[PDB]
């Protein structure tokens, strides 16, 4: 996350760390969102790779014991079967991973709260980005758990010529764009928390951002609209 401000470490109790082995070490490659006590919701590039993943839960600094972590290896990995690596234009950026035994809840792990489908945020709604992607473009993980304020662009502006234009879909979310704050390498699969009726939830997983960098004017950070999917998440997890 890319000029974000560290998270209090019960802010945002439902994002995850996703990590690969990495020889004798585990690596952070993406976040995600808890949204069963043994279900994670994440972005289908996220997983693209043919690693060994581990969630963490309860993850506030990547390189340090916060003495609240619980670490669970994933079991299967269900991806949208729309999804094509060499295509994320196209959208269906989405994947869910069922962990290898249920998490335990508390105050630094909880389950997120998806939208209803077919919900659609009014342009500039109040939105959250969080992750420990990088803080720069070509920059480093951050250590702690960031967040940043990313106010949405609505489709009609996002998919307009100076934004995205044709790549972006309604299935998608764009928030954030005023190059300063953004989503970075890192982030992906990740949350973005908007304020609904005085509740946060998890409007999307975060998806790209342009190859001209990450928090670049007019392009702002794109997510998979969970609201899109939700029929196809309670259909998953019914059959598994
Ligand atoms: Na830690």
Redesign the pocket.
């Given at each position: 996350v890319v000029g974000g401000t560290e998270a209090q470490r019960n802010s945002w109790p439902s994002q995850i760390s996703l990590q690969y082995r990495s020889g004798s070490s585990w690596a952070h490659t993406c976040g995600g969102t808890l949204i069963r006590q043994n279900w994670v919701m994440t972005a289908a590039h996220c997983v693209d790779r043919e690693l060994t993943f581990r969630v963490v839960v309860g993850?506030?600094?990547?390189?340090?014991?916060?003495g609240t972590?619980q670490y669970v290896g994933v079991q299967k990995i269900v991806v949208h079967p729309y999804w094509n690596t060499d295509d994320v234009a196209a959208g269906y950026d989405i994947a869910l991973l069922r962990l290898a035994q249920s998490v335990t809840l508390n105050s630094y792990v909880q389950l997120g709260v998806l939208p209803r489908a077919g919900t659609i945020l009014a342009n500039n709604s109040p939105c959250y980005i969080t992750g420990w992607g990088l803080t720069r473009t070509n920059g480093q993980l951050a250590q702690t758990l960031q967040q940043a304020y990313l106010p949405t662009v609505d489709y009609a502006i996002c998919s307009s010529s100076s934004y995205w234009g044709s790549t972006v879909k309604n299935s998608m979310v764009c928030a954030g764009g005023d190059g300063v704050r953004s989503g970075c390498q890192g982030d992906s699969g990740g949350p973005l928390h908007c304020l609904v009726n005085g509740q946060y939830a998890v409007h999307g997983v975060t998806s790209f951002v342009s190859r001209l960098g990450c928090n670049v004017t007019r392009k702002p950070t794109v997510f998979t609209r969970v609201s899109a999917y939700i029929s196809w998440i309670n259909n998953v997890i019914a059959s598994n």
């Open positions: 993850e506030h600094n990547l390189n340090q014991n916060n972590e």
